[PDB]
Amino acid sequence: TIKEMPQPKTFGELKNLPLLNTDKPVQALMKIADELGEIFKFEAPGRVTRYLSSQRLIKEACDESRFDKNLSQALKFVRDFAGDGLFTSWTHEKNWKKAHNILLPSFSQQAMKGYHAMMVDIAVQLVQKWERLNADEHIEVPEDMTRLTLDTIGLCGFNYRFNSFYRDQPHPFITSMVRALDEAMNKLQRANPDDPAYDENKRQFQEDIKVMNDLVDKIIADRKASGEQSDDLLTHMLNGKDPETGEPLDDENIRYQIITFLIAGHETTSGLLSFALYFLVKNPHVLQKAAEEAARVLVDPVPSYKQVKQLKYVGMVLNEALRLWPTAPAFSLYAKEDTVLGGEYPLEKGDELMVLIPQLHRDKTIWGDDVEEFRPERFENPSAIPQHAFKPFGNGQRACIGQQFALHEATLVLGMMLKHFDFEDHTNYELDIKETLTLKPEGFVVKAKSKKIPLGGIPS
Numbered sequence: 041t042i043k044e045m046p047q048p049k050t051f052g053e054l055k056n057l058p059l060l061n062t063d064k065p066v067q068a069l070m071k072i073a074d075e076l077g078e079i080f081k082f083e084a085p086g087r088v089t090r091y092l093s094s095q096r097l098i099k100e101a102c103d104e105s106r107f108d109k110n111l112s113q114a115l116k117f118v119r120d121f122a123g124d125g126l127f128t129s130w131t132h133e134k135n136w137k138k139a140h141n142i143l144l145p146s147f148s149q150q151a152m153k154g155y156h157a158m159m160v161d162i163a164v165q166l167v168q169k170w171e172r173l174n175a176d177e178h179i180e181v182p183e184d185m186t187r188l189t190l191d192t193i194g195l196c197g198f199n200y201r202f203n204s205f206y207r208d209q210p211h212p213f214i215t216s217m218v219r220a221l222d223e224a225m226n227k228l229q230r231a232n233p234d235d236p237a238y239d240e241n242k243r244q245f246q247e248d249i250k251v252m253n254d255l256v257d258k259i260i261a262d263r264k265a266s267g268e269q270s271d272d273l274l275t276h277m278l279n280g281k282d283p284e285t286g287e288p289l290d291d292e293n294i295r296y297q298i299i300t301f302l303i304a305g306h307e308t309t310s311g312l313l314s315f316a317l318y319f320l321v322k323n324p325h326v327l328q329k330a331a332e333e334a335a336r337v338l339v340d341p342v343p344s345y346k347q348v349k350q351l352k353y354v355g356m357v358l359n360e361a362l363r364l365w366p367t368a369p370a371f372s373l374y375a376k377e378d379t380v381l382g383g384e385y386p387l388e389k390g391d392e393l394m395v396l397i398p399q400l401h402r403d404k405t406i407w408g409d410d411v412e413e414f415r416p417e418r419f420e421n422p423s424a425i426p427q428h429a430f431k432p433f434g435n436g437q438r439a440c441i442g443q444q445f446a447l448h449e450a451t452l453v454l455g456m457m458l459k460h461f462d463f464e465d466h467t468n469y470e471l472d473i474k475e476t477l478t479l480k481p482e483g484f485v486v487k488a489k490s491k492k493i494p495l496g497g498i499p500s
């Protein structure tokens with residue numbers, strides 16, 4: 041039964057563009073979803089896309105035989121600095137499968153065991169800082185989670201220390217990164233982006249790229265200026281060869297990979313740890329249930345790989361946090377052939393679909409009526425969750441290659457945070473979600489009162 045595609049207010053030759061003139065476009069797209077239903081068309085000057093919000097429709101969207109990952113306009117803009125990398129490349133492009141096969145073993149279960157030692161190295165530094173704060177000072181959660189995650193990916197992946205905790209204002213790379221993603225977004229708003237009115241936006245943009253590129257040259261420098269025998273992410277980028285083609289990645293792609301993993305490998309993780317702590321301090325005895333498990337399991341000075349893997353309720357909180365507010369709230373898809381979505385909406389070959397992940401996770405027919413409440417107990421048995429009902433890490437082969445990396449780091453850190461500290465909502469903080477393609481709460485502050493539990497000495 042062919043249904044006609046519903047669509048919000050149109051605005052002349054700008055179509056649906058003036059509907060997103062906020063710094064919270066995704067949150068605006070969510071409000072539209074509650075208004076028009078499970079699917080709606082969003083038209084732009086040169087773009088046409090369809091946002092999905094129901095598990096039923098997204099179920100078929102995740103069918104790889106019918107749909108493949110599409111570069112949305114957001115990703116097409118990120119490709120200006122991410123380029124031929126693993127995040128902003130087409131599936132049919134030569135370098136995706138080439139880099140996928142080379143870098144996938146770097147995220148195997150055996151690789152995760154190797155990262156753990158360095159993950160605790162950075163996680164302890166986080167505890168060190170909070171332990172050494174005077175009683176009056178505030179804890180800036182998103183700023184310090186950014187310090188935690190950036191140092192972690194740089195160390196575990198590239199054997200490189202940003203030393204963000206030894207820095208006052210955020211790392212020069214972070215400033216360039218945030219401004220770049222902030223420039224990728226809002227450019228989605230410009231009707232004529234090539235209008236010279238945004239010339240200062242462009243030249244500021246390619247200055248930030250130069251900064252990111254300068255960092256890459258230094259990571260390669262420290263590596264080639266060896267340096268002990270290594271076996272991390274960068275080691276495989278330089279030496280790894282694709283079994284199917286026998287070739288190693290060319291340097292133009294390698295630099296694109298480093299940029300990709302430096303940004304994609306910490307930004308969304310930082311937001312998650314920020315969102316999680318927010319939902320914990322907002323839900324007291326849920327935080328209590330989680331605080332106990334940390335104290336009950338982590339019975340040593342520093343956590344082990346086995347101990348993090350058995351912090352099961354902590355992972356439930358992280359997933360429930362990923363449910364209500366996925367830090368990567370959308371991924372795009374295109375129809376490989378002509379087909380009919382949900383037996384109602386006909387699609388041309390190449391038509392784009394945007395999976396609005398927050399509204400997916402708020403499907404009342406999947407989770408119930410308490411879609412807004414924070415119940416980590418939903419993830420008691422993951423078996424009881426329908427297929428493609430909960431996808432904060434994308435879909436299929438184009439899914440997040442560092443999902444285990446994030447979840448382990450997010451569990452390891454949050455566990456130590458609950459073991460060593462009690463937390464207080466210093467303000468009656470009202471959630472303000474800042475959008476820079478990704479999602480991260482802004483101006484979130486707390487105060488930690490130590491339990492005075494000592495550490496080890498992070499030796500490995």
Ligand code: HEM
Nearest residue numbers: 126127304305308309368371432433434439440441442446
């Ligand atoms: C912590 C929360 C994270 C979330 C919510 C998240 C989300 C996602 C999503 C939705 C995709 C699919 C992109 C698309 O389909 O357009 C993706 C892919 C990817 N992610 Fe993550 N991610 C997270 C953490 C990480 C971490 C820790 C890494 C570490 C390297 C990482 C690296 C990547 C890479 C390289 C891809 C592209 C892989 C490919 O296309 O083959 N992400 N992620």
Ligand code: NI
Nearest residue numbers: 041042383384
């Ligand atoms: Ni019918």
Ligand code: NI
Nearest residue numbers: 176177178466
């Ligand atoms: Ni104060």
Ligand code: NI
Nearest residue numbers: 271272275276
């Ligand atoms: Ni290797």
Ligand code: NI
Nearest residue numbers: 325326329417
């Ligand atoms: Ni409870």
